[PDB]
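[job 0412] stage=complex_fold ligand=IMH status=START
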Amino acid sequence: SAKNVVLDHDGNLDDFVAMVLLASNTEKVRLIGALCTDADCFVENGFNVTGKIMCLMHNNMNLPLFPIGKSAATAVNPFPKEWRCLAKNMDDMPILNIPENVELWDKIKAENEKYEGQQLLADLVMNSEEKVTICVTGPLSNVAWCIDKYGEKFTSKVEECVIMGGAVDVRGNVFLPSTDGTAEWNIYWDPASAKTVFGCPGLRRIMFSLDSTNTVPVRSPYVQRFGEQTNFLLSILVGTMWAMGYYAWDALTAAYVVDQKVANVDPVPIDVVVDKQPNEGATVRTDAENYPLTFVARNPEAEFFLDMLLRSARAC
Amino acid sequence: SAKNVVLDHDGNLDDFVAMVLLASNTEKVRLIGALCTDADCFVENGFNVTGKIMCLMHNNMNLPLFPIGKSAATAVNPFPKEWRCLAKNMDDMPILNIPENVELWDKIKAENEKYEGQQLLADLVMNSEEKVTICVTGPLSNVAWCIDKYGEKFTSKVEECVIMGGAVDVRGNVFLPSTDGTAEWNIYWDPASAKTVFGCPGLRRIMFSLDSTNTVPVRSPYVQRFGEQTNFLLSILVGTMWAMYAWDALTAAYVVDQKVANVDPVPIDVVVDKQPNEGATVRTDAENYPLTFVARNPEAEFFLDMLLRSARAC
Ligand SMILES: O=c1[nH]cnc2c([C@@H]3N[C@H](CO)[C@@H](O)[C@H]3O)c[nH]c12
Ligand SMILES: O=c1[nH]cnc2c([C@@H]3N[C@H](CO)[C@@H](O)[C@H]3O)c[nH]c12
Ligand SMILES: [Ca+2]
Ligand SMILES: [Ca+2]
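[job 0412] stage=complex_fold status=DONE, emitting structure tokens
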């Protein structure tokens, strides 16, 4: 009884760990598509790594193929050049370049190159028989576009939108000379889109803000445990990615989609600062009457998540 | 018969690929030891990666263990912190943390933690029955130290010093506000030590300067070829390191097989003052100045195939 999930990511290392988490848990998740945004990555690399990962999994665990599209979304405020992916680095990793897998990817690559990521998101949600859960690990530009373009026809088909983004009762992570450090990168990348998303009535939202993700730092000892599973392709993959502060922001978010025990949620009316102020991009509690609620993750089960990841990485 | 070789490195990615090359070619190289310098890495991480690589190999093919020492050499001009952390990353790679191998490392770690890199180098060379080839892939502080402390007693025991460093007819790679870009990093890190080494009489030196290493850039299509060999631990290791020029690897390849390149005798001096061209390796006309055999036109394809083949040792 797996639910349909679409992954809307921006190709960084944790976006790919999130992908593995979602794809590996076939009992709970049926991954029907993914789109990559040119934010915290260079979209072509992110697109290719997504396909290489999908093909490796298809040939080793019977994971069904799914469409992958590149989003045309553009930044309001660009991610730092440095961080913009080791996705280029991941594209040359040996584990993602096994002939049988690379050959299959090259066979279906052309048709996926044809999709427009944003439309792909809209179509997968609207045309699916059952409702779709959207896992957003990059900026909210794509979900916002779908809301602006299809409205209720889109939102009514969304089971829930599980979002990695924001900072509610803690500091953010955007520290530039012109910012005060209260905003988080995914929101800051496109504040207006984030606002559209958080204020959309009739869209159920689960939000993994830094309040919860801060409890899961990526530490060496834990990362080295993937060394106990080198006979599993997914452990070489996940371990290598994490081997390269840093938190499992996107991974925690995806873990929740797999099993809601990862964390409890509490309703909070969320607005986003779009003006060019030092706190531009901040997700704040609004007093507006009848403002829609967003379910913010709290007290995530850290141990549970970490063990879930290590276990999922033994899928194949 | 294999020749005795000691790897004197500073823990960056190519340092480790060089180590794999030397270690995998048991027919040509008998790797009797290694030392790690806190230069292009943080020594502790460099130390641990060296050990993990050695134990990974020892547990999967015939390769005797050898002593690994931490050098106490300190920089004159440090590498940008950015590159130094790469050893930390490799230290957490899954292929280097397989339990049986880590346990082996944990088991022999005590014996190795007590060595002083510079002294271990002096000892391995001088106590060897045959002469020893030194493969230097980091700064020349350690060889200089041995020369400074033992002179002829040390050099007379060196078959040859194969060095990755300098730039002769091409531009360097040290681009900083205070420099003019004619210098190469390994030399720049410690110019004085380099001067002692390159001006040392009775020391045969083979030098892989940027002039030759520039002709072997690390390319994606080639790096992806390791994906054809995932059944080999060494291919997972090498491909992973190059995915995230082959300076040091070319230098070690030469040690395995000198067919990697022809060499030309050039009298090489080093600029030591704190000027913009500090650390540059410059040709000198001084009478009776010692010669250094500078590598030229390295066999690129031969080198790329040797590495691919070597990565299939296990
Ligand atoms: O230092 C960093 N390197 C790479 N990505 C991120 C991010 C990205 N932004 C989100 C967390 O702020 C999350 O989706 C992650 O992929 C924040 N900081 C870094
Ligand atoms: O951009 C870089 N990343 C990592 N290492 C180096 C080096 C180091 N210095 C030597 C080549 O200049 C070589 O031993 C290598 O380990 C130069 N540039 C870089
Ligand atoms: Ca992300
Ligand atoms: Ca080096």
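Residues 1-316 of chain A form a domain with the Inosine-uridine Nucleoside N-ribohydrolase; Chain A fold (CATH 3.90.245.10).
[job 0412] exit 0
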